[model samples]
Target chain A: ALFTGIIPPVSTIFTADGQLDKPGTAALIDDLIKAGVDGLFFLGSGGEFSQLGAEERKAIARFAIDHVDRRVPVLIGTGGTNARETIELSQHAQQAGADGIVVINPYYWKVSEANLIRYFEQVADSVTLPVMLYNFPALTGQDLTPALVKTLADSRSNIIGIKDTIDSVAHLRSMIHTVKGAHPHFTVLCGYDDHLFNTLLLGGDGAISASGNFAPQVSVNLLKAWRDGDVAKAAGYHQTLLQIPQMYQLDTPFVNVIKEAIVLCGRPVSTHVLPPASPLDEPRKAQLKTLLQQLKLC
Target chain B: ALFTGIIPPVSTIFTADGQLDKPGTAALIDDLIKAGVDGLFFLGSGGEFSQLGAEERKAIARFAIDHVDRRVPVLIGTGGTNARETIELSQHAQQAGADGIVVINPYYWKVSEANLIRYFEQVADSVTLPVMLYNFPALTGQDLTPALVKTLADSRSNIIGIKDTIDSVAHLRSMIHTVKGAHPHFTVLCGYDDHLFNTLLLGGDGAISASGNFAPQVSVNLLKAWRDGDVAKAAGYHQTLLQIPQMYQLDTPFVNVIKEAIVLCGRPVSTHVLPPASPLDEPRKAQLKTLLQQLKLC
Candidate 1:
């Protein structure tokens, strides 16, 4: 698969005043690449996509693509509440040389399937790069069912895969069976940390999970072990990976939690996030650190 | 109260190409003013504010405030995910001569109550004009409880009233009892159409309902009857007004539904809404027309 393995939806680094932190972003990206992440996904949910505007999104996409310098596959989140902006950003990502673009469905309003399908068609047709559908129904308030996804994947050649962020393993299993059964080459990556092993074991491709932002090596090691036919070694890593999902629960807006995880994982990057997502407070910060310590990640 | 009675969150008119329709907006505004609406609100949920960016929001806010020319109270939807953008847009509305600004809580990630309190404080503190809180729990995923609203009302003097959009009558009743009990002058308006009568009966001010876009005369009559102490006449108008809320149910994103209703009610304005909220399709549009025609709105 062109896009597979533990790709972190890297947490966006913002300065104390909420400007994009370029030096901190570079340091974070270099470490993730060094930790053996197969690809890098920017501006996904963990990257605080909702809080950013078009210009800011463009700046981050441009900076990340240039900073990575083709070290790995880079995916930019271009999906929004409308097709006009989504297509505009998708084309921008294509011109900027993104390996692929991830399109989440129109949020804010629950749209008809016909409008939604036409929306994805317009976005995918606007650019030549590979497209990965992002399904996070909890936030988006609309589920991309397996049948709908199958129709989308079959209709568009560039609509290659999905990052299913739903918590249910049954949903992911159905997605694997429904989409991969028709097209074996179609990628299906789990979005949550706990489902990485379950998703992989179900003949799925990989994960674009948030935990990879802080614990890249653990996931990288698990993926390597699984590929090398050491299922037991992979399971050992999976247990540790299982503990990481709870860290997200320590804070409501886990954008701050993820940044704090990066810090607690000992990289010591700036933990500042955008407003509406302030820095993790003391009690939650201590809880996150204790969990990281328990997992021996720090 | 500065903002009381049947103030329609006026549907923002748009061209077929999705640009703001200025002449069409003027026609709609003039019609509403002629219909005896107490005030006019723009850039609300009915206005497709979610689909618009900061520049588009600014344009609509500036145009509406100037075009209304101080005929009635003009409240613009300025609240967003971040306090910075909310404060900026709130200030813009103030400079543009808006009578008040409506602030909805951050929709994407539910922030800590502490952060949410600070967010409102920052926005209200920055602006000199009146601020009306908008609480739509279904869309925002955060409930501004009676306690929270009371705390916010007490903390800031410019924080005048709220458009409580939740479906439950008890929630609105509690809001009226709790908030108004302390501040006798606090304005509490119901957001849903059905709650307008009940809200007024419970010592609430009025409504910022969406049905007022097309059915302004009916709501205006209902409010007048209530204020004039003609209880029997008000109840009769309320029965007719009750039929209108179901028209919103015919479509998912009812921005399109409201626009189509405007056309069906004999205004013949453009039925174009922004994307993710396209024109109401055939069956739903037909249903909307039947409802309006039955109410003699056509």
Candidate 2:
């Protein structure tokens, strides 16, 4: 049960002029831990890890791990286009006392399986912390198949889990059956919000979803209901969760939307995201507010 | 004629431990200029720009521009996941005395048309340098469509051309017809190797291709034949050029493939690429050698 249950891939708070908002980050992290999330994940896509330089990533990782103060297990995202840096960051995470490190494959190139395996092995080998594989093919431009996941799991003992962000349930089911069948300790967390219930039903450990930034309660409740043998209650939570995915469609890079939802759900944090991802327009913000209101979340 | 005709997207020479090899870079540049290429484009996809940090990019841009000494029009690849950095690099290229800067749209997010246009406009406006749009849908995860290109071309005078790296002839044709029809001076260069002849036949300007790194003479000769109205002679060069595309298939992150091709063609520069892209193994290297041998390149 190392990395289970509603670990929100927390957003990196930025000031209006685009500097890191440290106070906002601390407030958000404190809020998530208080709201009953089992663990916390920092610097995932929602955290804008792609936009950050190595020094900035290290600063955020160090601050996040230090600030969380072992109230919950902290997993830091340390993936990039280069294995050298990925290993460097993973080691940095380990040294900084993160409970685990989530390493997404090199996004820029669709590398061969051998090279890909080599890349992961090098990273997992370099760090003693639990290493979670991150699979988001849409953004990374390459899918990490169940076979590939199993290969990595078999090869690296610390390669304990994956955040399967793929849209297809079949892919999720296969991932569960394939990797988890062999290594029962291997965690398979749903990476998207709506897939949480189905992922759990199909033997998923939990979700490391973006929506957890705004609405950790729904997922927390859903997981709790299921664990208590309250299928009916969990299904009700699932229904509410189903309404949330469409809000992602309101913007292209929905990092801003997640922050806005955080604000709409009554936590007023800065909505500033980095460049090439401008703030959500007023129309989209209004649409988001309306959706959250309909979900009884605002 | 600003950014056209066999402008080899020059490979960055890296030493064994992965430091930039300045001497090898200058030698490569010297060879390409002697081979009759119209210009040089550094820090391109072929240059492994994704693996480089901002400081590294600036260093290479500065080195390349200074070393080339304006022997030919030098275009630097100055695009990234962030517009602020892209504009910074574009301005750096302008200051370093680059003839033009090639700006690929943000590769991470599948941004909206409006947002994409805004990103390009900001980069183009930040510098007085002529800007060439780079469209490689495969790696970047989004295509810059003909309509988008036309809009950008019409809006900014400095956004003078594009390195249309897409694989489809139809995409290239529409790009030519749509953008060039409106702005007659807008340049369209083929991004891939095999598309060079067809791109020209379709009234495209020239190519900013990877193959031009090792085999500049083929493309240069091909362009000459096409210009002299010798369709038959150009077709012969096209057949030989067709054999070269498979060399790219010999490895993933074909930057190493391009460098290996440079060596196989007798340049003997360092073939070290940055991480996630290791040196091509012996098997693939042999396959690459055989392919080049068939083309009589070695």
Candidate 3:
């Protein structure tokens, strides 16, 4: 239940033919662990959980857990629109030796605060593993406000933490002050890569970042340097990691860009994103390649 | 393959326990059939498809098909973010004896056009039943463009029509002219409730309306009167149906309000809507009752 330091939202690796690249994924895990990240978070927005089929998501979780071998804690994103599917995926994650599961509020059909309370309570009760609530309103369109988080925390002991992805510092401050007062045990992790230094500086736990999939060492160093109170070092790395987040604004297949960046960084992984999410164009790829080279990442 | 005249997007009927009201739904269908609607479109936005679970959607489709019993064509809405799930539901509708299926483009993800083309082609190839594309962008945040429709039509014969819920006659005109030219056999139906008369006037097929569930006679009569060139009488009936659509504008639970209007008009269907959708408050109910009385629909 103790979550601190950097946790990367690990991207799933696919073969040239678009099948699950189990060996490539295992090698990527080893590379990330060697880079000294605190934990592994799989099947998140960065991992393209929505793009993958249910079975494929489960397979990725299994592969990660088996390959990780408990060198570090493994957290899986098991949330979806349906409660049953969420619960099912959560149970699968638990069975796959995941340390915790981050449950996102249902997207597509927005649920009421009352229903969401019941939903989290039911999901936490359905599995014995600790649950981390994911609050990203931009994608889900349903913000789990501080009051609702308190309500769910009061009802479920397994609801141990939240990954606050909203960009507003005021909202994050409110979440830290509100949830910490009621449930001191509940860990509040920042989900924004840009907020890693600020969140840690503000007496909060570390972040789970999409950009970390490409630049694990930069994020790991930033969090460690920030925690160590080396402000200059942390700020330098923060500016360095800013490019990864900037790439996302260019196109949606930024996940594809991240996968390609991993390969460009000399990591053995293919940038084969699934259907509906196409690969980045050559110009964007060249732009990213040039930026990575400038950062001495390539 | 011919689709002419009015096709109302029927409202889903639920009991007090939030279960599908078979008898109430059957009676409502009989009334619409008697009103001389061209066909019945179930599980649409008016039908509250997003509010219902997958099983509930399938059950409603089966019940409507059985009740109508070939009196008119029944088109079931089977669209979701998941392509596999959409295809599964579409197949269920096909097996349930639906005359055709309306596949809305994937929402939430904002998939690329190529993926959408593949999605429709796969769904069409999976069943023997006809397929009509549902393009409603306001709710889904996805607009099915005319170019994509043309491509889908060219790729599959089963993709024979489109029900446009955009509510712009000018846009609809361009869509009709463009798609009809490419696939001349394509049937283009309007999904706007208030535009039933104008739809017929513009040489488009009849509308798929939420208001039509309660005021089928008025809607059918308006279309009939318009088709017969009785512009004044059509306008009168169209104005009458406007009262219900106006009730919809008053609150978020427009679908539930439509069901309440049906029950208030002596059709004993329950006003039970699924979670995430609340029932009309007392003040809104009072306003709806007043509107019903003024329109003499109660």
Q: Which candidate is the best by DockQ?
A: 2
Query: Which scores higher on TM-score, 2 or 3?
Result: 2
Give DockQ: model 2.
Answer: 0.64
What's the residue-level lDDT of A157 in candidate 1?
96
lDDT of 3 by residue, A1-298 (tens): 4666888889889887878888888888898899899899999887888766568789889988989999999999998765666877899998879999999987765665656776788889889998999998766666899888888888988888889997888888888888888877678888888888777766678889876777788989887787787989989998876655766654554678788888888886788886556677789888888878888787
Decide which is better by DockQ, 2 or 3. 2
Ten residues in a row with the worst lDDT in model 1 chain A?
A79-88
Error of 2 at A29 (Å): 0.8
- Per-model CA lDDT versus the true structure: 0.87, 0.89, 0.80
Error of 2 at A26 (Å): 0.9
Give residue A65's lDDT in candidate 3 (0 to 100): 91
A1-298, model 1: which lDDT tens digit per residue?
6598889998889888788999999999999999999999999988988788888999999999999999999999997775677878999999998999999988766777877887788788899899999998887768999999999988999999999999998999999999999989999999988889989899998899988888899889999999999999999999998888888877667788888888888777888877666677899899988888988999
Model 1 C-alpha lDDT per residue in residues B191-213, reported as the tens digit of each score: 98888999989999999898788
Q: What TM-score quantifies how close candidate 1 is to the native fold?
A: 0.96
Q: In candidate 1, which residue pairs clash?
A: none
Model 3 complex DockQ against the native: 0.24
What are the clashing pairs of model 2? none
Give the distance in Å from residue A185's predicted Cα in candidate 3 to where it truly belongs: 6.0
Per-residue lDDT over A161-236 for candidate 2, one digit per residue giving the tens place of the 0 to 100 score: 9999988999999999999999898999989888999999999899998879999999999999999999999999
